[PDB]
Structures are given as structure tokens and as C-alpha cells.
């Protein structure tokens, strides 16, 4: 959790970003790298997923719906 507090300064923004990534992963999607929240935190700490990419995936899922 130290790397997750290293890639972003604020903690609540990290919580909201991991919540959005876990909501995207729970509906069924391929991850960047077993629980959805733990995989979201591992994808955050590996500097693979960004908030802009999360918003792009959410916009693609809203357009596909």
C-alpha cells in the first residue's frame, strides 16, 4: 500500500480511483496485468492504469450500453 501512496499523493483520490477500477473489473473485463479490488490496487501500484484511461473505458462502456 506504500507504492499506492507513492504513485499518488492523496489517499481518498486513490480510494476513489481504485473503486472505479474495481467497478470496471467486477462487471467483467481484462485486467492490465484474484479479487477485483486487490487486482485494481496492483494495477495502480504498477503504474499501468491511469484515471484518464479509466474514464475512457467508462465512456466506452457507456457508449456500448
Amino acid at each position: 500500500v506504500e507504492d499506492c501512496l507513492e504513485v499518488v499523493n492523496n489517499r481518498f483520490e486513490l480510494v476513489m480511483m481504485a473503486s472505479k477500477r474495481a467497478r470496471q473489473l467486477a462487471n467483467g473485463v481484462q485486467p492490465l496485468i484474484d479479487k477485483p479490488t486487490v487486482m485494481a490496487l496492483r494495477e495502480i501500484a504498477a503504474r499501468r492504469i491511469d484515471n484518464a484511461l479509466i474514464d475512457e473505458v467508462e465512456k466506452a462502456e457507456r457508449e456500448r450500453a
Binding site: 500500500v1 506504500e2 492523496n10 489517499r11 480510494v15 481504485a18 473503486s19 484474484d34 479479487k35 479490488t37
Partner: protein, 1200 residues
């Protein structure tokens, strides 16, 4: 009764609003509220289960009993909606409208509301300009009212009617008060009162006039009416909110509101029957008096009438109090997905995981088990899945093990006075009936293992699970919220093993050899060829951080070399080279958290607890009756004290000394005897074992169980050891007197009955003391939480360059708080260093090497933010060593950290330490003298006070005198509430030359002459002393009366920052006399919350004698002086309020009516017609929205 088709549809209510408006209710609006009128006081008819028509429980007024059903049964279908039956008139609708619809009562005579009359700020008394006793006599039918405002006895009314021949009208009762409230105007009376306000010259009459002006202004700008205070139409509660409870045998439980409603309806029907009969005036007067008394018992029972062995509840008692509808159902709610069990200790667990029973986790994780059983295909429906769960095969255990793997649970202690009372753990399935817990967790929980129960909760949403993983995990909460020390400390059984392993002996087997590395030491110890306590010079390789590796040879112990296998590469060997004690391992854990990180400290603490248990099991430490030694010196000093007390008894009986001085000499020589016996016992316990090395007996420290358990830590101190070896000394009585004879026997020998009587007396006194301490600590914690709850870190930078001067606190003895503790944790204001830079331990070490005395700091008492605290003015966080995040509620943490140790609370200037003496504010002719000293490092250890005319004798050594001669928790509660003392110190009002007194007219007068300004006279009582010289000069803020000063005259005279400095100094003095360590940011934000209100004296937009907020007055002043004005803003002074008055004086009527005096805040919000903007933390809990602190700040940013 039962309905399943309507139950499936959801999202019917949006529940989206912005504000909450509370005001009065007109009788036409109350008539538009209800749906029917009740007329009979009959709820349920006898010998049948059917409601009574036009009663308290009726179907024509509120709603049907059964769902989609009438009373007769003509309509028994769900398709019929909005149709009223013909025989019994009710709507065929849902049965949930009985909880929403309400009724009303048409009263034959108007009555007065008791919330506008019986309150001490009476509104009808201020609006009609009448006293309370006159309206109390008029409303209770004892006198008359002319219609200009004077009282009339019935005999005087008869003489007035005979003299006026029945021409002037005069009425009695509430109808005359209603006519008086109807025929008054709000505009012309306001202009008349403003005309009288410019001609008055009195003090209290001006206060009455501006109170009447404020009441008329509130009645004008609220949109209400003065005649709406009397109640013509009385609304009733819905019957589903006040249900009847049945008992066995057909009986029903008694109710409180139903009996009052039946009494009101019965007296109203009796009044209607007496009015239709055309009764005389006495009978209808008594009936109206009984109607007023029943309305008073219905609204607020127990105030004036107290209608009944036990008084029943009413509408006023159902809101206020602890058992009301506000504290039992809104703040604290019963939750599901939760349970409790007893706790045991689990040494095999990790820090982030805990134990959980199998059936308990099966009951808690039942919906996830049902969902996984539906997904796996083992059951088509949930009924077969539930039967497979209750059958308890192996597949449900596989499902329960697969579900609980990555799902955290919230473990909670039943008292939650700590910030860390709720922690998140990853549970495992154990074969038991208790909840296993890690031993490093119960220190922060303050939980024992004898009958302790802990309630668990499971988060089920994804956001709640991620919040519990991020900011509630036990591995993330290492540091304490009060101080910088970590809350995880190794307890007694592991520091006992560490102290047994780290000690060294003189002569042991296997010493004097050289080993290669740590693995050779382990291989030599595991083959039983070398003892654990042996001075063996080993060679270890450690890297040094700035990472360069190095090797060296150190002369250590075998146990200290075995301890080096668990230390990481970052920690140096200078910390683990000494003997392991409680403070040594505490500062070692602190250094490992400071210079290495987070997870390495967690795994190091886990390995440390493991090796502590492993080397405390192999030690076999046991206490017995042979470990406690009894000296002959104890008997020697006992016979010496017996001879000396016989000598002083003969000297007292001879007639040379009195009884009290002899008794004081007796208790002093017995205290000296007990001190000498305790010193001899500590000398014969701690220095008992003498070892022989190389044929010579060299003295070393003894290895006894009691001495090791006293020296290691996390056990009893030396006061507990001296009660077992030597005598326990004198005993204290609760009246204040010490007993003349002590207890000259420990627990190892026998105790007499007269000593055991004093022992159980002291035990009962201590038990009552800690009971009242726990109660007062809980009350102070609740008050401090409700005071400081609006401060939220909103912005990152403000731009305030005010600052605060930090000085080390010396109170005439040992230091209270040094510079390295008070400075560390905040940014600086002025260059001492670079401004707006967070200070670390390296900066504190650099400032200590530079020998700095005072540095300007940025505190929260001087901030320029709008409804919040800046992130830079607060400094660093207490749980994490970095900067405080945006959105952290720093008020609740501060109040909880102040409320931590409340259950644990309770001439000659000769220097003690050496160092150079430097005078401060000296000229001996000096008003305020400080005899501060400077040590070699540059810190101030001693600081003594110097009176007027102190002769100083003086690179000054210790043991000399520079100036020779010149002839608990209620304290913290009185500091926070700022109560006036019994003897208040009168300070100087103005800075001028002191003059002689005036003529004495019962009180002393003191005038201070100025250059151009006139002298000001201050009255003082002649009972107290006074020290004013004739030919002397008095500076600003000097104290002319010796006594305890109040916060008010300290705040209003010289400034704000010395007031906060004095408050922080006194609170830290109390908390360091206790022994605990609490940071000063909590006291600073409490002082900032206490200074929220401001008082103006002459303004153009607002009034001249009203209080307002600081930031609101500032934004109104800048909006006034920004455009088309030059002399707009006014000068104001800061005012102080206590903790009981700061939370009540709030524009939010929900949070102000939350803890104390609900009726006063409710009637104030009803009269003024306030609007709650929901800009708080508790009102978002009451309404049900998100908390505007932490993860909910983005929702409040996107909402507005």
C-alpha cells in the same frame, strides 16, 4: 397484513433536497395537513378486534388496518384504488399510509403553547412587554385583561364594571391573550421602539429594548405571525408511530401518548357539552383550566403539572434526553450483518489477519455464500441452497473458504473512546467459538482477555471494502493519533524474553571466542556449546543508508548476536547493542518506522514478537516465595523508628511541643523510615547476585524474577516492588488526614485487621475515584467531540503570515514540553530556515545543533480560511509522517486524542541543574522576573520567578542560590468551559501611570492617569487584598490583584496569542503532572473553535450589541467596503465562549439541538425561521447524505 406485489417496486422516492426550513404553523396549514377530525376517545372496542370509527385508531382518518381491504369487506381486490367505500368510508389503498397520514383536533377554546411561555427566554412575555407571573395568572384563569395592559383581580374587575357600567371590554383566559396578539402591529411598534431606543439612558432597559427589537425583527423577516403561537387546531401523531403492544391473554400494554390524547379529547368534549348547555362562568372557567392543564400535560409533561407512581412520557420527552428518538435511532442505530463473541489470544496469526469462528462466518457471509451457490449450480433456487447450508456438507465449507479469502471485516471494541477502536482484518476460519486476535492489536484496543467481547462488522460494498483495506487496516495504523510514538509496542511477555536474551553475565561457558557471522552464532547456540549470556566478540555486516556495505567486529552478547538476525539492513547496530527495555524497543520501533518504511517495520515487529515468545518460553521465568528477600536492615530501621517515636511521644507528653507538630514529626519520620526501608529492599534485590570471575568476586546485576519483571517494563514499578519486600508506608484517609501509625508489614508477611481496614478503605476510594473519572472523561469526550466537528482540511494553502512564537514550557521545576517536541511536526512562518517547509527529525537536529531558542510557527489559531483549516497551518499528520491530506477531519481526531487519558488523570530561588544563568526582562526593580538558566547544549532547564526587590548574588555552577531570599480532570473541564474562578485576578485596564485611590464608598477605586486620556476607575471589593504602589508605573496587561486570572480579561486586554499560550501551558502542565504526552495541535484547534464568535460595537449593516461569526463578518465587511463605500467596515473585538455555549450558538439548528437544551434551540429556530444549509458533519448523518470529509469531498464538490 401481507403484500408481495407492491413490495417489489423501488426507486419511488428521490430524496434530493438542498436545505431544511423550520418555521411556525398556521391553523389553516394544520387543517390542510390532516385528513380527518377525531371526536371520540375510543381506540379499540372490547370483545372484538376492530378499530373504532372517529377515534384515535380509526380507518376513516388515517388508513386501513389490512392491506387493500376495508372494515366491512366490500372491496377485496388490488385493482380497486382511489375508491371510498359507502358503509365505512375509507380508501382502498396501501397500508403504509397509516404511518404517514395524521389527524387534527378542533378545540372549543384556544390554548397557549407551553414552549413559548414556560421557557425562561419567554417570547410572549417579550412581545407583550409583560412579566411571566402575570401571563401565568391570566392563562390559568385567575385574573382579567383590559383591552391598556394591567392586571385585574375579579373583585377589582367587579368594581371596574360597576364604575364603567359595562362599557370597557375586559376578557380573561387565552382568548384575551389571542386578541392582544392579534391587535398588535409589527411595523409601527418597531418604529416606536426605535424612537424610544434613541432617547433611553439605562443599561438593562437598553438590553430589554434591543431584545424586543430583535424579536420584532425576527417576526418580521421570518414571515410568521404573532397570533400563531396559540393553538386553535391541535394535530395528532399517526397511529403507526404510536402502536399498541399486546400481552398474553388478550391484554394490551399501557401507552403514554394515547392516554394524554384521550384526556384532551374527553375534556374538549366536556367543554363542548358545557358550552351547548349554556353553563355559568365558573364551570366553563374550570373546564377551560382543565383543558389548558391537559394540553400542558400533552405537550411537555413534568414541567408544571407532572401528570401521572411514575410520570408517563410526552411529546417533549420523546425528542430530548438520552432515551429519545434522536440519540437512540439517529446517531446510534442497530445494524445487521454483525455479531459479537469473546476474544482469545492467537500467537500464530499475523498483524493484518485475525481469527473468526466457522458458524459465525457462515452466518455473517450468508448472502455471498448464497450467491456463490447460485453461481456454481449446486442449487437451482435459494430454498435448496438454504437447506444445503443448514445441512452443513463440505461444499458449503469450500464456498465459505473461497468467499472469506479477500474480504475484510471490521473488528470493534465495545467502548470506542480511542481513534483506533475500529480496525480491519482479513479473517480466517478456525475450529472454535471465539475470535482469535493478534497480541500486537490489544494494546491499541486497550483490551484484556478475561470476559472481553468485541462486536464485528462486515463491509459488503466495493467502496466500503476498499476503504477498509486502505484507511482501516491494522498494518497501516501504526502510529498513535495523540503523539508521534507508534501505538504498536511489544507487551510484557515478549519484552521479558528480549530482556532475558539481551543481558550479559560475567562467567559463563563459551565466552572469549570469535565468530564469523550470525549463522555461526546460531549454529553454536543450537548445539548447546555456548550459553545465551556470554560476552562473545562477533563479526557482523551491515549497510549504511544516506547504500554502502561494510563489515566490523563488535564485542556483544550471544543473545544480542542472535537478535541481529531479525533486524533489517537499514537499522544500525547502535540501537540493538544495549539491553532491551520498554523505552529502548519503543524508540527502536520508532527509528525503524522513520528511516526504513512501513511494511519492513510490520514484518520486523512480527519477527520480534515471534523471537520474544520463543525466548520467553525457553527462559522459564517464574516467581516464588524465595525470590523476595527480607533484610535485617528493615528490622533495624523499624527499631530505630520505634525508639524515635517513643522519644517524640515522651517529648509531646512532657509539655514542650503541641499535638499537631508532634503528629507532623511522626508522619515525617515514618515517611523517612519507609523510604530508607524501600531503598534497602531495592539494594538487596537489585544487587544480590555476586559472580566469581577468574577467582575474584566481581559484583554484577542480580537475576531475580521480581527484579527482571520490574526492570524490563510493562509491569509494576518500584512502588509495587516496595510493597512486597519492605513496608508499604503510611495510608491516606479520604478526609485528608494521614494515619498516625503506618503498616509495618508487607504482603509476604501477615497483615493485621487494622491494617487491612485501611487497605480496603484506600481500595474503595480508588474504585470510586476511577468510576467518577471514567464518567467525567466520557462526558468531556462527548462535549469536545460535539464542539470541534466542523473543521475540515479544505485548501492546501491560505497565505497567512501571522505566525506564533514557540517557547519551551518551564514551570519552576522540570521541563514540561521541550523544544524538540513542540517544534517538530509543523511548518515555520519566518526565516530563523525556509518558510512553508515541513520540519523533520533532521531539521530538529540541525536546530538543536544551531542552539535556537524561539522559532515562529504556523498554527491553526491564526488562519484566514473560509469554514476550514489550511493544510499548511495544521502541519503534518499524526498517523502518517507526511503532510496532512486534503479532506481529513482534524477535529474529531483532536477531540478523541484530548479525551484519551481522562480515565487516568489522578521566596527562595535555588537551582538544581548546572548551566549559565541568563536574565530575561530585568532592570532589583522588575515587575515580571524570570530566573531562566541556559545549559551547555542551549536548552532551558530551570526558570524561577523573581519578586519585587529580589537580591541576586550573581558561568554559575549547581548547588548554589543566585537569588537568596526576598520576604485533575475538573481542572481541564474548567479550562475548556472557561468558568469564572472564586477569586478572579483584576488586571490593568489601560497602560498608564498608577495614581492614588479616590474616596472609599464601600469599594476600592484605582485610577490610571494618561498623557491625554482621562483616568479610568475600576471598582474592587474591600475583602480581597490589593498591591498598587503610589509612585509606580503600570504596563499594559499587568496584574494588580493576586489571584487566578480568567480567560476573558486575558483575551480582551492584551491579545489572543498569550491566552492560547497560557491555555496550552496549563493543559500541558496538567497532562505532564499526570504523565501522558498529548500534542498541542489538538489544543490549538480547540482554542480556534472556541474563538469562533466575534462582537461588534458600532456597525451600519448589523446591530451594535449582537454577536456574529468572524468569517461572516469579514465577508460582509469586504463586500460592503469593496464598492461605493469608504467608511464601511467596523472595528470588532474577539469574544470567548465555553464548550457549552459554542456548540449552542450555531446557525445550524440540527447540530445545535443535538446534545443539550433541545427545546430552547427548537423554539429559537421556530421563532426566527432559520434555514439549515447542511454544511456540517453531524447533519449529514441525520439527513443521510455523504460525509463532507475524506472520500465524500468530491461528491460535495460535484453537487454544488
Amino acid at each position: 397484513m401481507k403484500d408481495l406485489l407492491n413490495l417489489f417496486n423501488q426507486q419511488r422516492q428521490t430524496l434530493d433536497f438542498d436545505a431544511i426550513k423550520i418555521a411556525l404553523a398556521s391553523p389553516d396549514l394544520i387543517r390542510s395537513w390532516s385528513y380527518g377530525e377525531v371526536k371520540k376517545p375510543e381506540t379499540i372496542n372490547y370483545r372484538t378486534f376492530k378499530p373504532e370509527r372517529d377515534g384515535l385508531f380509526c380507518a376513516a382518518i388515517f388508513g386501513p388496518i389490512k392491506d387493500y381491504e376495508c372494515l366491512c369487506g366490500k372491496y377485496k381486490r388490488m385493482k380497486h384504488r382511489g375508491v371510498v367505500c359507502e358503509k365505512c368510508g375509507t380508501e382502498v389503498t396501501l397500508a403504509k399510509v397509516r404511518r404517514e397520514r395524521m389527524g387534527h383536533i378542533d378545540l372549543a377554546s384556544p390554548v397557549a403553547h407551553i414552549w413559548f411561555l414556560k421557557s425562561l427566554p419567554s417570547r410572549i412575555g417579550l412581545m407583550l412587554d409583560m412579566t411571566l407571573r402575570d401571563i401565568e395568572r391570566v392563562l390559568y384563569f385567575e385574573a382579567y385583561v383590559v383591552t391598556r395592559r394591567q392586571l385585574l383581580t375579579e373583585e377589582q374587575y367587579l368594581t371596574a364594571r360597576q364604575e364603567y357600567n359595562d362599557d370597557f371590554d375586559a376578557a380573561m383566559g387565552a382568548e384575551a391573550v389571542y386578541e392582544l396578539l392579534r391587535t398588535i402591529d409589527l411595523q409601527s411598534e418597531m418604529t416606536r421602539l426605535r424612537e424610544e431606543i434613541a432617547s433611553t439612558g439605562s443599561e438593562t432597559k437598553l438590553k430589554r429594548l434591543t431584545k424586543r427589537i430583535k424579536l420584532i425583527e425576527a417576526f418580521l423577516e421570518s414571515g410568521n405571525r404573532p397570533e400563531w403561537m396559540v393553538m386553535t387546531v391541535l394535530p395528532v401523531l399517526p397511529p403507526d408511530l404510536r402502536p399498541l403492544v399486546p400481552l398474553d391473554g388478550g391484554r394490551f400494554a399501557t401507552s403514554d401518548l394515547n392516554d394524554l390524547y384521550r384526556r384532551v379529547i374527553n375534556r374538549n368534549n366536556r367543554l363542548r357539552r358545557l358550552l351547548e348547555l349554556n353553563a355559568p362562568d365558573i364551570i366553563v372557567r374550570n373546564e377551560k383550566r382543565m383543558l389548558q392543564e391537559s394540553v400542558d400535560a400533552l405537550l411537555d409533561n413534568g414541567r408544571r403539572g407532572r401528570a401521572i407512581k411514575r410520570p408517563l412520557k410526552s411529546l417533549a420527552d420523546m425528542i430530548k434526553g438520552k432515551q429519545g428518538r434522536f440519540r437512540q435511532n439517529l446517531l446510534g442505530k442497530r445494524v445487521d450483518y454483525s455479531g459479537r463473541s469473546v476474544i482469545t489470544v492467537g500467537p500464530y496469526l499475523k498483524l493484518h489477519q485475525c481469527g473468526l469462528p466457522k458458524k459465525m462466518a457462515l452466518e455473517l457471509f450468508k448472502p455471498f455464500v448464497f450467491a456463490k451457490l447460485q453461481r456454481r449450480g449446486l442449487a437451482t433456487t435459494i430454498k435448496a441452497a438454504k437447506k444445503l447450508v443448514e445441512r452443513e456438507e463440505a461444499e458449503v465449507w469450500d464456498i465459505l473458504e473461497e468467499v472469506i479469502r479477500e474480504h475484510p471485516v471490521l473488528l470493534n471494541r465495545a467502548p470506542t473512546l480511542h481513534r483506533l477502536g475500529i480496525q480491519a482484518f482479513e479473517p480466517v476460519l478456525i475450529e472454535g467459538k471465539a475470535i482469535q486476535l493478534h497480541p500486537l492489536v490489544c494494546t491499541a484496543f486497550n483490551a484484556d482477555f478475561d470476559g472481553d467481547q468485541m462486536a464485528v462488522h462486515v463491509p459488503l460494498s466495493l467502496e466500503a471494502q476498499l476503504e477498509a483495506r486502505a484507511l482501516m487496516m491494522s498494518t497501516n495504523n501504526i502510529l498513535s493519533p495523540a503523539n508521534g510514538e507508534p501505538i504498536i509496542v511489544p507487551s510484557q511477555d515478549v519484552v521479558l524474553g528480549l530482556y532475558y536474551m539481551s543481558r550479559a553475565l560475567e562467567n559463563k561457558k563459551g565466552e572469549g571466542m570469535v565468530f564469523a557471522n550470525t549463522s555461526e552464532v546460531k549454529r553454536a547456540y543450537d548445539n548447546r556449546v555456548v550459553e545465551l549470556h556470554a560476552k562473545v566478540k562477533v563479526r557482523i555486516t551491515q549497510v549504511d543508508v544516506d547504500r554502502t556495505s561494510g563489515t566490523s567486529i563488535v564485542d556483544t552478547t550471544v543473545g544480542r548476536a542472535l537478535l541481529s538476525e531479525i533486524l533489517p539492513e537499514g537499522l544500525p547496530f547502535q540501537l540493538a547493542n544495549t539491553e532491551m527495555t520498554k523505552k529502548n524497543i519503543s524508540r527502536l520501533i520508532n527509528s525503524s518506522y522513520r528511516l526504513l518504511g512501513l511494511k519492513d517495520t510490520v514484518v520486523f515487529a512480527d519477527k520480534l514478537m515471534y523471537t520474544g515468545y520463543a525466548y520467553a518460553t525457553r527462559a522459564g521465568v517464574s516467581i516464588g516465595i524465595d525470590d523476595m528477600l527480607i533484610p535485617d536492615e528493615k528490622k533495624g530501621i523499624l527499631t530505630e523508628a520505634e525508639a524515635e517515636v517513643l522519644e517524640i511521644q515522651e517529648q509531646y507528653q512532657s509539655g514542650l511541643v503541641t499535638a499537631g507538630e508532634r503528629y507532623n514529626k511522626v508522619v515525617d519520620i515514618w515517611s523517612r523510615t519507609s523510604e530508607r526501608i524501600a531503598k534497602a529492599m531495592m539494594d538487596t534485590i537489585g544487587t544480590e547476585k555476586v559472580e566469581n570471575a577468574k577467582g575474584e568476586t566481581i559484583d554484577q546485576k542480580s537475576m531475580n524474577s521480581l527484579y527482571i519483571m520490574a526492570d524490563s517494563g510493562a509491569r509494576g514499578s518500584q512502588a509495587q516492588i516496595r510493597q512486597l519486600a519492605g513496608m508499604r508506608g503510611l495510608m491516606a484517609r479520604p478526609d485528608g488526614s494521614i494515619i498516625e501509625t503506618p503498616i509495618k508489614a508487607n504482603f509476604r508477611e501477615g497483615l493485621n485487621v487494622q491494617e487491612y481496614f485501611n487497605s480496603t478503605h484506600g481500595a474503595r476510594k480508588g474504585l470510586a475515584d476511577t468510576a467518577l473519572k471514567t464518567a467525567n472523561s466520557g462526558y468531556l469526550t462527548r462535549r469536545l467531540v460535539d464542539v470541534a466537528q466542523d473543521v475540515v482540511i479544505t485548501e492546501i494553502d491560505c497565505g497567512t503570515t501571522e505566525g506564533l512564537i514557540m517557547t519551551p514550557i518551564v514551570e519552576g521545576g522540570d521541563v514540561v514540553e521541550p523544544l524538540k517536541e513542540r517544534v517538530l511536526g509543523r511548518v515555520v512562518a519566518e526565516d530563523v530556515v525556509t518558510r512553508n517547509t515541513l520540519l523533520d527529525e533532521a531539521w530538529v537536529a540541525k536546530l538543536e545543533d544551531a542552539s535556537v531558542q524561539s522559532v515562529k510557527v504556523r498554527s491553526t489559531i491564526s488562519c484566514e480560511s473560509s469554514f476550514g483549516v489550511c493544510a499548511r497551518c495544521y502541519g503534518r499528520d499524526l498517523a502518517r509522517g507526511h503532510q496532512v491530506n486534503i479532506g481529513e477531519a482534524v477535529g474529531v481526531i483532536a477531540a478523541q486524542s484530548i479525551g484519551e487519558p481522562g480515565t487516568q488523570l489522578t521566596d527562595n530561588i535555588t537551582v538544581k541543574t548546572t548551566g549559565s544563568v541568563k536574565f530575561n526582562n530585568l532592570k532589583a526593580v522588575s515587575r515580571s522576573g524570570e530566573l531562566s538558566v541556559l545549559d551547555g547544549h542551549g536548552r532551558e532547564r530551570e526558570r524561577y520567578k523573581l519578586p519585587y526587590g529580589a537580591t541576586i548574588t550573581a558561568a554559575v555552577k549547581a548547588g548554589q542560590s543566585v537569588a537568596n531570599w526576598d520576604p485533575g480532570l475538573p481542572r481541564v473541564a474548567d479550562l475548556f468551559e472557561a468558568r469564572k474562578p472564586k477569586d478572579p485576578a483584576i488586571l490593568a485596564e489601560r497602560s498608564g501611570i498608577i495614581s492614588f485611590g479616590k474616596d472609599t464608598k464601600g469599594k476600592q477605586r484605582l485610577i490610571i492617569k494618561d498623557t491625554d486620556g482621562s483616568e479610568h476607575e475600576e471598582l474592587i471589593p474591600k475583602y480581597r487584598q490589593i498591591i498598587v504602589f503610589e509612585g509606580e508605573h503600570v504596563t499594559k496587561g499587568e496584574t494588580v490583584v493576586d489571584g487566578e486570572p480568567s480567560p476573558q480579561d486575558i483575551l480582551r486586554l492584551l491579545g489572543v496569542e498569550p491566552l492560547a499560550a497560557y491555555l496550552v501551558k496549563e493543559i500541558q502542565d496538567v497532562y505532564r503532572l499526570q504523565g501522558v504526552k498529548i500534542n498541542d495541535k489538538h489544543i490549538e484547534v480547540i482554542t480556534r473553535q472556541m474563538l469562533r464568535k466575534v462582537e461588534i460595537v458600532d456597525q451600519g449593516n448589523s446591530k451594535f450589541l449582537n454577536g456574529e461569526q468572524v468569517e461572516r463578518q469579514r465577508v460582509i465587511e469586504e463586500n460592503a467596503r469593496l464598492v461605493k463605500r469608504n467608511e464601511l467596515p467596523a472595528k470588532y473585538d474577539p469574544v470567548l465562549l465555553g464548550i457549552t455555549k459554542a456548540s449552542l450558538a450555531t446557525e445550524s439548528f440540527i447540530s445545535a439541538a443535538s446534545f443539550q437544551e433541545t427545546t430552547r434551540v427548537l423554539t429559537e429556530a421556530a421563532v426566527r425561521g432559520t434555514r439549515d444549509n447542511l454544511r456540517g458533519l453531524k447533519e449529514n448523518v441525520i439527513v443521510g447524505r455523504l460525509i463532507p470529509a475524506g472520500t465524500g469531498l468530491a461528491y460535495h464538490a460535484g453537487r454544488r
